[PDB]
Amino acid sequence: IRLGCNVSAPSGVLERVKELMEDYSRAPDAKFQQQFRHLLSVNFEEFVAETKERNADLDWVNPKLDERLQLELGQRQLEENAKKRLEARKKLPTMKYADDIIQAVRENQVILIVGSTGCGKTTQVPQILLDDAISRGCASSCRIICTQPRRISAIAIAEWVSYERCESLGNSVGYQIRLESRKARERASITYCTTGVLLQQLQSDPLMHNLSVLILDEIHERSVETDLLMGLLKVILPHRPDLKVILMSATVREQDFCDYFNNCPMFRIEGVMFPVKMLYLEDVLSKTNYEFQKRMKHEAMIEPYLRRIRNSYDSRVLDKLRLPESEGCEDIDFIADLVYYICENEPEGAILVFLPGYDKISQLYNILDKPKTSKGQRWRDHMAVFPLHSLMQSGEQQAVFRRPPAGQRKVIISTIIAETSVTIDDVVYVINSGRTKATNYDIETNIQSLDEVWVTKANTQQRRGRAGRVRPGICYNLFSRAREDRMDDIPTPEILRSKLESIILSLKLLHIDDPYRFLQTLINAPNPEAIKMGVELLKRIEALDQTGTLTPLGMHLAKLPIDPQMGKMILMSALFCCLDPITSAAAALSFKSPFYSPLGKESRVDEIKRRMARNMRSDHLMVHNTIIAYRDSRYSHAERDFCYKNFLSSMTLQQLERMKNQFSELLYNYKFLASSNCKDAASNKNSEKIPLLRAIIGAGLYPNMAHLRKSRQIKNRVRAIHTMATDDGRRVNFHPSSVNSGESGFDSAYFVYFQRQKSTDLFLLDSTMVFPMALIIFGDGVEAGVTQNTPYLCVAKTYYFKCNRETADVVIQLRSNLEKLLLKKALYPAPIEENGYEKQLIKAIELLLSLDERL
DNA sequence: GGGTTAGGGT
Numbered sequence: 001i002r003l004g005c006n007v008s009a010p011s012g013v014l015e016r017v018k019e020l021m022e023d024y025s026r027a028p029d030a031k032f033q034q035q036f037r038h039l040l041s042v043n044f045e046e047f048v049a050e051t052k053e054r055n056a057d058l059d060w061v062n063p064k065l066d067e068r069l070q071l072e073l074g075q076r077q078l079e080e081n082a083k084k085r086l087e088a089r090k091k092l093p094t095m096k097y098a099d100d101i102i103q104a105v106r107e108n109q110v111i112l113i114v115g116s117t118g119c120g121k122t123t124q125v126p127q128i129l130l131d132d133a134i135s136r137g138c139a140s141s142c143r144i145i146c147t148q149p150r151r152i153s154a155i156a157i158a159e160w161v162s163y164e165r166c167e168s169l170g171n172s173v174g175y176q177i178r179l180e181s182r183k184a185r186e187r188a189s190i191t192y193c194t195t196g197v198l199l200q201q202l203q204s205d206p207l208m209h210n211l212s213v214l215i216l217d218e219i220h221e222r223s224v225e226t227d228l229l230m231g232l233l234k235v236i237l238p239h240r241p242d243l244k245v246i247l248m249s250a251t252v253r254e255q256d257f258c259d260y261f262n263n264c265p266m267f268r269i270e271g272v273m274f275p276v277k278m279l280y281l282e283d284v285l286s287k288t289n290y291e292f293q294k295r296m297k298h299e300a301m302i303e304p305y306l307r308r309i310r311n312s313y314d315s316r317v318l319d320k321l322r323l324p325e326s327e328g329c330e331d332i333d334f335i336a337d338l339v340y341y342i343c344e345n346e347p348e349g350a351i352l353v354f355l356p357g358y359d360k361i362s363q364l365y366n367i368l369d370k371p372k373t374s375k376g377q378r379w380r381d382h383m384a385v386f387p388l389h390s391l392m393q394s395g396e397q398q399a400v401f402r403r404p405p406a407g408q409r410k411v412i413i414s415t416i417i418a419e420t421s422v423t424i425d426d427v428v429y430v431i432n433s434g435r436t437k438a439t440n441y442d443i444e445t446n447i448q449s450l451d452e453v454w455v456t457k458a459n460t461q462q463r464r465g466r467a468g469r470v471r472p473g474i475c476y477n478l479f480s481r482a483r484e485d486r487m488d489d490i491p492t493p494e495i496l497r498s499k500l501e502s503i504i505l506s507l508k509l510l511h512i513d514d515p516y517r518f519l520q521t522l523i524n525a526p527n528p529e530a531i532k533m534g535v536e537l538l539k540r541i542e543a544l545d546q547t548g549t550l551t552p553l554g555m556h557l558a559k560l561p562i563d564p565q566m567g568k569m570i571l572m573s574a575l576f577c578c579l580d581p582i583t584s585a586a587a588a589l590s591f592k593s594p595f596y597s598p599l600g601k602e603s604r605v606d607e608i609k610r611r612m613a614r615n616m617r618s619d620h621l622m623v624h625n626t627i628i629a630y631r632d633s634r635y636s637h638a639e640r641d642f643c644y645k646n647f648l649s650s651m652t653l654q655q656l657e658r659m660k661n662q663f664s665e666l667l668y669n670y671k672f673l674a675s676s677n678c679k680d681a682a683s684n685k686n687s688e689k690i691p692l693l694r695a696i697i698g699a700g701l702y703p704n705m706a707h708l709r710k711s712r713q714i715k716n717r718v719r720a721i722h723t724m725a726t727d728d729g730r731r732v733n734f735h736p737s738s739v740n741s742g743e744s745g746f747d748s749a750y751f752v753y754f755q756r757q758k759s760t761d762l763f764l765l766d767s768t769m770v771f772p773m774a775l776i777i778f779g780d781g782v783e784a785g786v787t788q789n790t791p792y793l794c795v796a797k798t799y800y801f802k803c804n805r806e807t808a809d810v811v812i813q814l815r816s817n818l819e820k821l822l823l824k825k826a827l828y829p830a831p832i833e834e835n836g837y838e839k840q841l842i843k844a845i846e847l848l849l850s851l852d853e854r855l
Numbered sequence: 856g857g858g859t860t861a862g863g864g865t
Contacts (some may be wrong), residue, residue, distance in 0.1 A: 178863055196863040358858050399863055437859035561863035736856040
């Protein structure tokens with residue numbers, strides 16, 4: 001056991017804290033409390049009964065409206081902007097199965113529609129069921145909800161279906177996503193929403209009385225939310241005999257969903273796609289005859305294969321398969337050659353290249369742009385080459401989606417983003433390197449890693465389809481068919497890779513109180529040891545009690561659309577009057593960063609971030625300064641150039657702002673704020689006290705701490721070697737994308753972080769420098785004692801600091817009062833009065849935290 | 856000295 005810096009406090013400060021805690025201690029309307037005990041009192045049977053009576057709107061119908069809509073629909077299908085829009089609908093494969101679908105839904109509570117790209121299931125099935133109900137004089141009883149995994153899908157599909165009915169958005173079809181909705185009319189309507197929206201709406205409607213039909217789309221993708229929702233459907237559907245659910249899926253392990261709903265009827269609907277034929281590594285080498293020159297366990301795989309194709313391909317080609325380097329994207333000059341080849345033969349169309357990530361995308365972009373081969377300089381000005389990556393701007397721009405300039409061929413170098421999320425139309429050739437990146441959690445070592453892995457069979461199929469939108473194409477797979485038989489069917493369903501604290505907490509608000517029993521019923525049960533880690537984290541931040549029952553704090557946390565830790569940090573910012581910068585920190589962690597990472601500008605992005613960090617040594621405060629600067633450029637009508645100069649996505653920035661206000665409105669509705677504006681002066685009297693902000697941030701990211709021990713100033717220009725290790729002892733560093741990477745001379749040696757992850761070493765993706773006293777006040781594992789002959793005060797029983805007894809005894813009594821205050825604020829929420837008993841304890845905490853302000 | 860990809864009423 002070692003000993004850290006002294007945290008004893010001056011006597012005058014100690015005496016004023018004592019006065020203020022004694023003032024706090026001589027203090028003597030909660031609908032929320034009654035709500036909370038009421039949730040805890042009812043068993044599941046009473047829960048259902050109460051929700052049936054509470055959500056009763058669809059027990060009511062409008063016969064004069066039924067009749068009106070039935071009439072105008074009959075009329076509008078004799079007019080000629082419809083009845084042309086109807087011919088082109090009847091060209092879709094799904095419309096041929098219309099009448100069977102109507103009847104199959106009528107006879108079964110659950111059906112499944114399976115169909116490939118082009119089958120129109122997503123646009124047609126909701127219209128089929130709606131127009132049917134309208135024509136039968138049942139309009140007002142019909143409310144259809146169709147889920148989508150991605151926000152952009154929910155918008156575009158809704159817009160298209162609305163056009164297909166000669167309506168503007170918001171009449172019979174609408175959409176709802178986070179913080180943005182063009183809502184449909186109440187009844188006889190179709191609404192497209194992202195799955196999360198429907199999950200959150202269960203809090204009020206836990207058995208789905210406010211919709212008549214639920215369509216789940218894209219379930220084959222096995223997102224957490226669709227996997228969650230089907231599990232909840234097994235609980236909901238026994239009490240909802242009238243509800244109709246339509247599962248919808250691509251042709252990837254379609255049988256599992258069918259099996260899971262015990263055997264329900266399954267439609268298979270043909271697609272509309274132009275033929276894309278697959279080549280593999282043997283076939284590409286035969287047309288290109290590139291030559292490679294500048295464990296195995298490889299040839300164990302490839303040699304048995306090599307010989308049953310002995311007489312089908314040339315002798316020199318099957319030599320190059322022997323090289324482990326031929327498969328994947330290890331040799332970028334090979335893929336470069338295959339792009340050069342497609343430009344020559346193989347008439348005109350765009351080339352879509354799927355590479356694993358940013359680093360390797362950059363290597364091929366430079367080869368394509370500044371080539372050292374003679375053949376490539378021939379092609380350089382006759383390609384228009386776009387990279388494609390979530391962190392790069394090209395996606396949010398018009399060009400990559402449009403056809404190239406005359407005499408130019410378009411080449412797109414992309415990550416998996418172009419498989420389903422981003423879609424380009426004039427692709428005819430796909431180069432599928434077969435390599436992608438993935439995050440895996442090793443439950444035993446608490447190490448998240450980012451590893452390069454092979455794609456699955458399903459992925460490769462999806463990439464093939466991206467060539468067959470406009471005309472027939474070709475898909476070049478840079479691996480042998482011996483590899484494809486090594487590949488998995490699907491990616492690992494993401495429920496198995498995820499932290500579970502959020503779901504377990506959310507389940508309690510649906511009166512699913514046993515997360516082990518319920519989660520075991522999903523299509524793939526998560527590891528029960530990952531459930532225990534979830535419950536444990538929730539017990540530690542005090543959202544669940546020791547027995548595992550919900551606490552008043554946890555119910556609030558469950559009602560915030562954000563992870564429970566950052567929820568708690570957002571909440572703390574309300575009681576401690578630093579609302580604006582903390583919700584910026586929260587929003588940027590829950591969402592992504594507003595900074596692009598354009599190619600070749602890695603050096604300059606680092607300067608921009610350091611400059612916006614304002615030497616405050618926190619990746620989180622750095623985002624808030626960015627938001628403060630962004631608002632100012634809107635006040636100066638200089639937004640575009642501010643965004644240009646500093647590589648900022650105005651789109652993510654504006655969404656971060658909408659998230660900040662959502663948090664404000666919720667905390668305001670929950671009686672924690674006097675004002676719903678996250679910039680209100682009253683909610684922000686403390687927002688420039690930097691030591692205070694590190695304390696509230698630490699209260700959120702705790703217990704994820706690191707301690708730094710080393711220096712360097714020799715001698716290149718500006719870099720330093722760190723010796724740093726997390727609370728568990730493992731040696732870490734700041735990720736190069738962090739503003740603290742390579743920095744020197746820190747006012748404190750301790751940091752908190754949101755994500756640790758190993759790619760080339762164990763990195764902290766984001767950090768904020770914290771001070772020990774702040775950790776001690778908001779953390780746990782705090783005891784005072786004597787170890788060498790020295791009095792100490794510790795945190796997490798891991799970091800021990802010299803501390804005299806007078807300071808320790810006061811800090812310990814202070815933490816006691818802090819816990820008492822948090823416990824009441826959760827049960828009996830109210831804003832903290834500016835001149836009350838509760839403010840005196842707050843002033844006690846600010847007083848101790850300010851002792852660390854930089855002189 | 857490095858960034859696979861999606862998401863959260865009123």
